[PDB]
């Protein structure tokens, strides 16, 4: 029930840096933490973690993940952290984070994410730390942050933000809630390129 390359004890499955090419299957149903970071997993298959509804922490960071089934984390109502940084993720399928009502940490930094659905974080009521650092986001649609009622910290930088009239809400949001702490900058238009989104008056975000 414990993969031969990993060490499992105290409900933790630890397969950190053991050459894994896929998520191991038939683990104990009681598992509360799964450590799969620093392997070469490429695919998160349909309802991958759905058998383990007692999961509180998943670490999938520093793999080669380019594909996530939309029900990869379905039913994980007790999940507190989802750590996905350092993969090749390009889009978040609809409902990927559906029903993760206990999630507190979501790390999506160092991926290739080029857009976010306005409902991407619809169920993340209790999230405290989100990172989208070092992705390919040009914009975030007004409303994407509305469901984040417990948010305390965001890492948004190293994204090519176009600071036009469609990102103006984010200027206002951050003036009100100065919780962006990685020094997010505009990259376009040229008039605002390389300036911190928090240092720019909203009135300057125009189309």
UniProtKB/Swiss-Prot annotation:
It comes from Homo sapiens. This is Slit homolog 2 protein N-product. Coiled coil: none annotated. LRR repeats lie at residues 30-51, 54-75, 78-99, 102-123, 126-147. Disulfide bonds join 6-15, 163-186, 165-207. Residues 159-207 form the LRRCT domain. Residues 1-29 form the LRRNT domain.
